[PDB]
Amino acid sequence: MEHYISLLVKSIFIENMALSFFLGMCTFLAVSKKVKTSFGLGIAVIVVLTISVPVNNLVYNLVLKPDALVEGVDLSFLNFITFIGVIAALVQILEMILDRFFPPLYNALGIFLPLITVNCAIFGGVSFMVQRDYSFAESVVYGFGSGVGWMLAIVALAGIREKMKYSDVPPGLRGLGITFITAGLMALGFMSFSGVQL
Amino acid sequence: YEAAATLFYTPGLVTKRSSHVRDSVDLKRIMIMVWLAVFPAMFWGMYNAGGQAIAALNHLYSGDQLAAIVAGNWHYWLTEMLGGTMSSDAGWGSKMLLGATYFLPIYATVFIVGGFWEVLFCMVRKHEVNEGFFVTSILFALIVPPTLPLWQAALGITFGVVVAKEVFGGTGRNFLNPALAGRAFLFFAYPAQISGDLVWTAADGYSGAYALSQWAQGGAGALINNATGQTITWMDAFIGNIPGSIGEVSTLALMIGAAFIVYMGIASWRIIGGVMIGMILLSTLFNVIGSDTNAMFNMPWHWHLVLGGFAFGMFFMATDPVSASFTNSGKWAYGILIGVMCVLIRVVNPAYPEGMMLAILFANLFAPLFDHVVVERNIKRRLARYG
Amino acid sequence: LKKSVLAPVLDNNPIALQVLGVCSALAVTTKLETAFVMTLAVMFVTALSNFFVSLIRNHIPNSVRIIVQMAIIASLVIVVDQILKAYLYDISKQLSVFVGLIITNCIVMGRAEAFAMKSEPIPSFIDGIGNGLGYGFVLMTVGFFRELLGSGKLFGLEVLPLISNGGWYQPNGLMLLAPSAFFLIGFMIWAIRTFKPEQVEAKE
Amino acid sequence: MSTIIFGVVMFTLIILALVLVILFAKSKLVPTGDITISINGDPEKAIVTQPGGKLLTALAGAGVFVSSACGGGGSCGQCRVKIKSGGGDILPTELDHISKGEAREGERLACQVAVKADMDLELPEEIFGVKKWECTVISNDNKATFIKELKLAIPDGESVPFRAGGYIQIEAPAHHVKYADFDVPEKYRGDWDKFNLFRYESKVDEPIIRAYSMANYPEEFGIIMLNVRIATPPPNNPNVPPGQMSSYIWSLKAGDKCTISGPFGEFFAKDTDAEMVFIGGGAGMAPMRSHIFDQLKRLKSKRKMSYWYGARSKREMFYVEDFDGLAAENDNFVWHCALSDPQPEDNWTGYTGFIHNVLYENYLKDHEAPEDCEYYMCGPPMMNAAVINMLKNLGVEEENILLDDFGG
Amino acid sequence: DSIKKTLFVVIALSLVCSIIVSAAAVGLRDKQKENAALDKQSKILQVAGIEAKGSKQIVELFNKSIEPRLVDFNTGDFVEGDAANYDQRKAAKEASESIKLTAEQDKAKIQRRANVGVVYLVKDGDKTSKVILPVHGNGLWSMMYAFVAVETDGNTVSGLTYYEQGETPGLGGEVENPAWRAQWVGKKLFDENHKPAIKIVKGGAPQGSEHGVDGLSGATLTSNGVQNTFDFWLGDMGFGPFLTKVRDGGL
Amino acid sequence: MITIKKGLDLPIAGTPSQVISDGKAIKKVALLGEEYVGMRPTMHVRVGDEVKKAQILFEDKKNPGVKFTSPVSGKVVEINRGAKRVLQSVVIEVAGDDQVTFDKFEANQLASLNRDAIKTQLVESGLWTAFRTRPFSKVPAIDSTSEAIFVTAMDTNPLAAEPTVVINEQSEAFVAGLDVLSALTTGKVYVCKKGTSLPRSQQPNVEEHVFDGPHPAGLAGTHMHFLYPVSADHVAWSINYQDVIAVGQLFLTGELYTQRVVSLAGPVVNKPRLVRTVMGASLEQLVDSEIMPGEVRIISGSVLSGTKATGPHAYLGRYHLQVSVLREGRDKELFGWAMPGKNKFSVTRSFLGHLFKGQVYNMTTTTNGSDRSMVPIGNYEKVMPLDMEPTLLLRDLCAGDSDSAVRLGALELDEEDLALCTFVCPGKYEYGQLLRECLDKIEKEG
Ligand SMILES: Cc1cc2nc3c(=O)[nH]c(=O)nc-3n(C[C@H](O)[C@H](O)[C@H](O)COP(=O)(O)OP(=O)(O)OC[C@H]3O[C@@H](n4cnc5c(N)ncnc54)[C@H](O)[C@@H]3O)c2cc1C
Ligand SMILES: Cc1cc2nc3c(=O)[nH]c(=O)nc-3n(C[C@H](O)[C@H](O)[C@H](O)COP(=O)(O)O)c2cc1C
Ligand SMILES: Cc1cc2nc3c(=O)[nH]c(=O)nc-3n(C[C@H](O)[C@H](O)[C@H](O)CO)c2cc1C
Ligand code: FES
Ligand code: FES
Ligand SMILES: [Ca+2]
């Protein structure tokens, strides 16, 4: 369908929030050393942001939308509460299930879950969903697109920092500064799709 | 001074261990050979700039007011006395002279300030002055609008050297194209000086649109140039008589230069093949789809191949081995990706008229990911124990 | 004592030595009048949250400590949000989501999980104020070096006349985008690590 | 006004539902079962604990504590253990002191192992015998300006089994001791007065454990002999706290007893019989004398070696009554020394300066085959660096160079 | 067990924090609602020309002068109701009060149009001198919203101000330039044939032109956007049926 | 496996005519102590002692045993130590004919001996210094055994002797060597031969595999890839054909066989030929009067992978079958980097060399251009034929990492093959020695 593919490509390439909204950088610039290390984190972000968007959208359209529970009353001033609470509960439960029911997958996904239990890149996604007021069928697609775009961005940065093993960075900038400059140049590259419509 | 003998002479050293014979090709030869490959394009671009300037200016002004104008900016103030006249039938002696008077200050400032940065950093780290600066200086000076003031170019090259290449550790150590980063700096920080309709023609007080941008607002019959009033045809844009930048015209006069290096093995032909196949495939797809809106949907591949800034970028910017992928099968992916982007962001992105400068910076980021994928496949093969 | 609060300014800078709190830093600094409010909010929220969590540090459980700590920090951020929308709503519109993003701004997370969980409430409060001030130093310097070049103004008050009014300056367009923050922070890190050499990273 | 309580109850309900779901998941999935740790391969006894604890700290509660010198802090870098089951998940923090080749056979850093499932240990036999004793100091002679010959009386004359070069564990309680009452001879009292070392004191409120290496050789039992070094802080930094454990031992009085424990083997002499070169510095005199006595008085192997020592002055010289006798007693053993700045009354003739130059100029530079012998160094870094640089210049490698330090 | 020791503390802290959170939330709601208006009040007063310094004065003279009103786009007639709390932005988001436009209808690139809008009238008494019209269209990067002030003749523009545009400053978002705004005084919306004749002229409109306004320097997409916005919202599917009545009188 | 389509065999001047001829007199013969990777010296001799042929001369203290034997009788004259007391060369002077005798067998017995007996006799003789383990190039331990023993019955090094002429002379000795090798495997013996015909053995364990094409199609490293991929857990052994001849002579007669055939040739060699000599002969005395007047650098081994032989190193290496000479190119040329030289050479088409088919150059030892960072220009792709991607493996090697090099396949190589990729590099790096450093690091930390 035009809408349910346009929204996906939109979230994937035009507003990559790793590099167009610039969220989640505290881990973007921290866990980026090996491609086969950042791939697992990308997968974990994909699953967390594909799960936490639909449930939050359901609860928002059910009990925190104004007049949705009782006419003339609203509960706008606890949306942050419920978003962060459901995010933390889902992360904890998923980590416990990963360690219990399917142990071999813990090495690939379960280890990374305690890091992203709270994060800008996920909270901002939830807030943007609630701000743009999506329906469920498009909200799930938006969440999946956001996750996959974040995974793509972090994997590309891991590849760049792997290739840069031949560099001769000056001693002062060694590490953190060169990572920041690389991310800035990455933004300069990704400014290509600033104006396209979808 | 007498110190230039270091870069004139060969050092005259001998090997010490391992292979005691060495191939005679080297970095100092490669850079200079690229430096000598653009000339059949640079001279034509200078001539074209002079011609467009003369045609537009004499189409606009005449008489005593024209005398005042030619007694205005130092371009005309100098070329009127140095052996030429500003009339409508002027030939080489005025056209090329005006083009050179426009181009030389930009180059002489870019080269000086970039060389200052390079010598400062090289003296701080105490290595020999690298030879990868001439190519970047030429390839940046060749891709700016003629009316661009000197200090904006100085800031652009300063950014493109210090922020993109020099900090990462010099030639061969960086990961993104220095000259294209330098042009992106201007393209994003001063849009009213590098893009538009008032900077593409050297004539003072004249308005002339980018050749490509006219199709974005009208059909194939809207490619009209107001220099004297004619129609821009495919053969016209292929010979390179359209308005445009100082060096990105005359696709033929640039292909003649680029074929030399491509045949010589300096530039990989795999990337060129991949970019061409991607561009033709995606443009044919768009043409088949079609739509009454966004008039650019109908331009075919043979029209895309010559318009605007495609040929020069494809032949020189893409083939940069440091930025490009390394694996033999990854070069194809790099080429196809850049070929898709240079049409996608020019067809379905109305905000920007020119695309290659963005597409190269986009694909440089994904250059090593293809390398990693191919390497992982090869390692899987080896662990399967078949070589 | 006075001598120990300035450490997060240079010695243990939260954005220079460690990687906490970068999203707000690189997103808010488009102006200066917004950077000041963002730094005051971070300072006050961090200080109060550390004080409270250290006050009740001996009775909360470690099984679900995440929920309790994010509840006690959310009950403060959801108050500062209403305060901003009641007094400085003209500023608050500009920050948009980032005013709410103080929930997960890793400064509070790290400081609460590192210091207030095992220290006395008053040192926890002082630690919070110090870390906030250290973060605010970088915030304000990046804000100055962005706004002054991007608009010829500081705190929304003209200092460099623009070319529209025949001024000496032309507003740089790139500074108003995001990649300006990245390079500015990078050169800031270079200066910090070259004037305080003991923080230089290792080779291998 | 009405919506305030409504928001309150909704907030409480949603938080309670979240916590209820979290605990409903927790109380049905987490194993929380008994975990059994085998101290050896099919051992006589096992340990049962709860998951989540550190392996070394859990095991130390039942015994068989390890030779780690930081007590679980990960600072020693030598809490090496071997486990062949439970988990092969080597941690990146263990790679600091574990190698790719050695990791393949289940060796681990116990300080970084967190217990989650059943696993088995394969610790060597001799570790199981670690225990504690309390002994009385019977001689605390001041053999030099900064050393003491601390003699201990072992209870019941028990012959503790050990190899030369091993180290025992000693504990000390909280203390407050001033240096004005230490046993210093009047000749060395002038040297102490030179910087007024009597004025120093230290306040310690904690128990402290360290490691000490015995001077006597294994065939000598019932009496254990330890050398203790000066505990003063550097004069250039007067406010640096002094050596706590060393201060306690220096202040320990005759007749009064202290607790000893943990005879741990390390720095073993090689099984071969090649020529040996013995270089010592400062407090390494105890392991040097132990190793010298060991094979000679116990094994009687027909080896050949020499002991080279460096001293500030003749005042800092001791054990000459033993070395000058043994050298004449047997032709297999020689000993030499050099003085840095001997006093005019020392009447010294022979080698002077630092030990490295005299070693090179007297023995190594004209040796027949320096690459077929062994080297042992036990001394301060300012001598260790010089001797190792000399030896690497001479052409010996890591497999022949053996050394350690006395905790700094 | 930790069960009771966790439930007790979590419920106690929830009760502790919910009361303060809710008290803060409901306490400031009045101030939020009141302060949400000034950012638009300043623009409306400035476009009407009644300068007011300070929020107190701004609300005072707006309460004195301007009367909000509603209008039906079809037939160009007024409707009953109140406009002080009418959400024009939301009115386009619901089918009951909006219609999705088609290809020939979508000249402003909005795709949505409310069935009943809001029109502001400035008064010096029981008669109207100027009438403010809120008009919006789609630019290059995003939407733009603006006020066009016309006199009671239904022909002349008295002032134009864009209170939020979201374009690139310097060339795109130059619509906020006071000099560019000062051009719009005296221009004419319609011609003799009653058709909308406002034209954005590139390179500078001819001096004294009655239908031209200078095109934005180097922002042709933005100039085209503003031209499309006016050409749509002055047509018979916009404020044209109402403008006919403005010229008919009774304003 | 039968063909290769990459790599450029270097067109040099002074190719040797493949005709065996007698050689000059030999005075000093030495054993080099640095080419034996990982070996550390423990000598059983002192300056002035007297030794016999095949007698133990020195043994290494790393490996258990693997005694190195003097190649001919005489007396020890000097021991040239190096910096940090490394063993460089043990020079002995030829005198007398005292030798150590070993057991002898018959032709029929040579296929069914006992493996332990064969190994004992071989290691006691000292020919065990020949075999090298492919993943690390070190001589195998005294007791190890692997199922793949590769015999290099071809040679495609530049200006090198043709094995078809040498093997044909000894004839049945090669067959005896192959038959005795057939039992020292536990696997199979692979002999890599050109399209021509070679003496053939009747043991089903051995095999014949045909290879032909450019230069890299003759090294054991490349022979590995298409027949038995070497891994960390699958080591394999390689030996040149003359050592097979020596082993066959040993187990057929009972005395160590020490003669060698060296292909003295080069750009500056007055008259190339196939010389007969004893291993480790003094190069300065072997090349006497065969040089034309001029400053020359005597280089042992093949030109791409040899070691300079000035002074203490002036002796034939154990693993080298050829000697070369080059003219010292110390001259400085004005704008020579840009001058379109007719006589210059380059793998890329950036010079006039590739226009003239079959032209022959007098290449010298000039390192064109100083050290610069490698771009690269995709030069290595035309060179390396093994199924691996070198244009980034070389970057990894130059970065100092070892963990990823092992993954990419740095194990399957050595300085024997990577020299060709060092030769074509534009940055003028030394990947040949860099690979040795990386392999040493992996061996140490492994
Ligand atoms: C295996 C082994 C064997 C040993 N064998 C012997 C032996 O045979 N004989 C022997 O004498 N010792 C030996 N030692 C060393 C023994 O552990 C000493 O007691 C050691 O000095 C620790 O004792 P301490 O804690 O009293 O002193 P430490 O405090 O560890 O060191 C004393 C010195 O350090 C200074 N100091 C204290 N705290 C600090 C600080 N925070 N910063 C800077 N300087 C500080 C003190 O002022 C003083 O100068 C051995 C150690 C080991 C590990
Ligand atoms: C970075 C950048 C951003 C731009 N943004 C806008 C914009 O927001 N609106 C606009 O009308 N033009 C914008 N432009 C300019 C247009 O792309 C283009 O130059 C203009 O439409 C000139 O068209 P013309 O030649 O037909 O007059 C921008 C240019 C650049 C380089
Ligand atoms: C074929 C070729 C193309 C090049 N293209 C560029 C280019 O587009 N821009 C540039 O700045 N340098 C270019 N260079 C110069 C050089 O490779 C560049 O600065 C590298 O990024 C340096 O590492 C080129 C060099 C070669 C050989
Ligand atoms: S990543 Fe944005 S605050 Fe942590
Ligand atoms: S307990 Fe100290 S290193 Fe592990
Ligand atoms: Ca409106």
Q: What is the DSSP string of B213-280?
A: HHHHHS-GGG-EETTTTEE--HHHHHHT-SS--SSS--HHHHHHHHHHHHHHTSS-HHHHHHHHHHHH
DSSP SS3 for F374: coil
Of A168, A189, A191, the CB nearest to B170: A168
Beta strand C153-154 pairing with C157-158: antiparallel
* Domain membership of residue B271 as a residue range: 267-382
In whole angstroms, how large is the CA radius of gyration of chain B? 23
Q: Is residue B262 included in any domain, yes or no?
A: no
What residue spans of D82-185 are helical by DSSP H? 100-103
CA distances for C55 relative to C48, C62, F214, angstroms: 10, 15, 79
Q: What sign results for the dihedral spanned by CA atoms B69, B73, B75, B80? A: positive
Q: Which residues of C touch A49 (CB under 8 A)?
A: none
- Tokens 């085998």 found at: D38
Q: Residues of D within the annotated binding site for [2Fe-2S] cluster?
A: 70, 76, 79, 111
* Strands of D101-238, DSSP E: 107-109, 119-120, 132-141, 147-153, 167-172, 175-178, 201-204, 208-213, 223-229
User: What distance in Å separates residue E13's CA from the closest CA in chain D?
Assistant: 9
Q: Is residue B312 included in any domain, yes or no?
A: yes
Question: Count of alpha carbons within 13 Å of C9, Cβ hemisphere only?
Answer: 11
Q: Is residue B344 included in any domain, yes or no?
A: yes
**Angle of helix A120-132 relative to helix A79-100, nearest 10 degrees?**
130
Amino acid at A174: R
CB F423 within 8 A of CB B23: yes
Residues F86, F103, single domain; the answer is no
Of F140, F132, F323, F314, nearest in space to F219 by CA: F132
* Domain membership of residue F234 as a residue range: 1-21+98-338
A131 CB within 8 Å of a chain F CB:
no
Q: How many domains does chain F have?
A: 3
Q: Is residue B19 included in any domain, yes or no?
A: no
Residues F55, F145, single domain; the answer is no
Q: Is residue B84 included in any domain, yes or no?
A: yes
CB contact under 8 A, D19 and C67: yes
* Domain membership of residue E189 as a residue range: 25-251
Cα C36–chain centre separation: 9
CB contact under 8 A, E221 and B198: no
CB A33 within 8 A of CB A137: no
CB F420 within 8 A of CB F7: yes
Q: Which residues of E touch A194 (CB under 8 A)?
A: 141
d(CA E43, CA D313): 93
Q: How many domains does chain B have?
A: 2
Q: Which residues of C touch E14 (CB under 8 A)?
A: 71
Chains in contact with C, where contact requires at least 3 CB pairs less than 8 Å apart: A, B, D, E
Extract the tokens encoding A126: 């939830």
Q: Is residue E117 included in any domain, yes or no?
A: yes
Q: Is residue B17 included in any domain, yes or no?
A: no
CB contact under 8 A, E171 and B207: no
Pocket test for ligand 1, best of D204, D239, D240 (most atoms within 8 A of CB): D240
CB C28 within 8 A of CB C35: yes
Q: Whose CA is nearest to atom 50 of ligand 1?
A: D406
Question: Count of alpha carbons within 13 Å of D198, Cβ hemisphere only?
Answer: 15
E170 CB within 8 Å of a chain B CB:
yes
Tell me if B34 CB under 6 Å of ligand 3.
Answer: yes
What residue spans of chain B are helical by DSSP H? 5-8, 27-35, 39-60, 63-70, 74-79, 92-125, 133-141, 150-161, 178-189, 191-194, 213-217, 234-239, 251-264, 269-289, 301-304, 311-312, 328-347, 356-383
CA distances for F32 relative to A123, F51, F306, angstroms: 69, 17, 13
d(CA D68, CA D74): 8
Q: How many domains does chain A have?
A: 1
Q: Do chains E and F touch (3 or more CB pairs under 8 A)?
A: no
**Helix (H), strand (E) at residue D166:** none
CB D79 within 8 A of CB D56: yes
**Angle of helix B92-125 relative to helix B133-141, nearest 10 degrees?**
140
* Domain membership of residue C36 as a residue range: 2-203
Q: Which residues of C touch A175 (CB under 8 A)?
A: 201
CB C191 within 8 A of CB A177: no
- Tokens 């001029």 found at: F294
d(CA F262, CA F315): 13
Q: Is residue E11 included in any domain, yes or no?
A: no
CB B120 within 8 A of CB B76: no
Q: How many domains does chain E have?
A: 1
Resolution (A): 3.8
CB C191 within 8 A of CB C149: no
**Angle of helix B150-161 relative to helix B92-125, nearest 10 degrees?**
40
d(CA D215, CA D285): 8
CB C20 within 8 A of CB C142: no
F64 CB within 8 Å of a chain D CB:
no
Residues F137, F78, single domain; the answer is no
CB A135 within 8 A of CB B140: no
d(CA C55, CA C68): 13
Residues F51, F108, single domain; the answer is no
Determine if the peptide bond prior to B149 is cis (ω within 30°).
Answer: no
**Close Cβ partners of B108 (under 8 Å, ≥ 6 residues apart):** none
Extract the tokens encoding D49: 């604990």
Best to test chain A binding among D20, D29, D32 (most A CBs inside 10 Å): D29
DSSP string, F150-207: EEE----STT---HHHHHHHHTHHHHHHHHHHTTS-SSEEEEEE-SS-------TTEE
CB contact under 8 A, C67 and D18: yes
d(CA F147, CA B245): 68
Residues B192, B46, single domain; the answer is yes
| β partners of residue F90 | F31, F79
* Strands of D292-394, DSSP E: 305-311, 333-339, 374-378
As to burial, measured by CB atoms within 10 angstroms (0-12 exposed, 13-18 middle, 19+ buried), residue F188 is middle
Biggest CA pair distance of chain E: 89
CB F382 within 8 A of CB F410: no
Of E247, E3, E238, nearest in space to E117 by CA: E238
d(CA C99, CA F40): 69
A100 CB within 8 Å of a chain D CB:
yes
Q: Is residue F120 included in any domain, yes or no?
A: yes
**Close Cβ partners of F160 (under 8 Å, ≥ 6 residues apart):** F16, F263, F302, F321, F322
Of E224, B293, D168, nearest in space to A197 by CA: B293
Tell me if A143 CB under 6 Å of ligand 4.
Answer: no
**Close Cβ partners of B85 (under 8 Å, ≥ 6 residues apart):** B94
d(CA D372, CA C89): 83
Chains in contact with E, where contact requires at least 3 CB pairs less than 8 Å apart: A, B, C, D
Extract the tokens encoding A4: 């349910």
DSSP string, F334-356: BTTTTS--SS---SSSSSGGGGS
C66 CB within 8 Å of a chain D CB:
no
Beta strand E67-72 pairing with E77-78: antiparallel
Residues F63, F184, single domain; the answer is no
Atom of ligand 3 nearest to the CA of B31: 27
Amino acid at D334: V
Residues F89, F106, single domain; the answer is no
d(CA C14, CA C21): 7
Nearest CA in chain E to D6: E22
A180 CB within 8 Å of a chain C CB:
yes
CB contact under 8 A, A85 and D18: yes
Tell me if B132 CB under 6 Å of ligand 3.
Answer: yes
CB contact under 8 A, C172 and B185: no
Chains in contact with A, where contact requires at least 3 CB pairs less than 8 Å apart: B, C, D, E, F
Residues F271, F397, single domain; the answer is no
Q: Is residue F344 included in any domain, yes or no?
A: no
Experimental method: cryo-EM
CB B382 within 8 A of CB F409: yes
Strand order in the sheet with F74-81: F28-32, F87-94, F74-81, F50-51
**DSSP state, C22?**
-
User: What distance in Å separates residue A99's CA from the closest CA in chain D?
Assistant: 9
Q: What sign results for the dihedral spanned by CA atoms E224, E225, E230, E232? A: positive
- Tokens 């607002």 found at: B217
Best to test chain F binding among D275, D371, D388, D400 (most F CBs inside 10 Å): D371
d(CA F249, CA D325): 62
Pocket test for ligand 5, best of D59, D66, D79 (most atoms within 8 A of CB): D79
CB F366 within 8 A of CB B22: yes
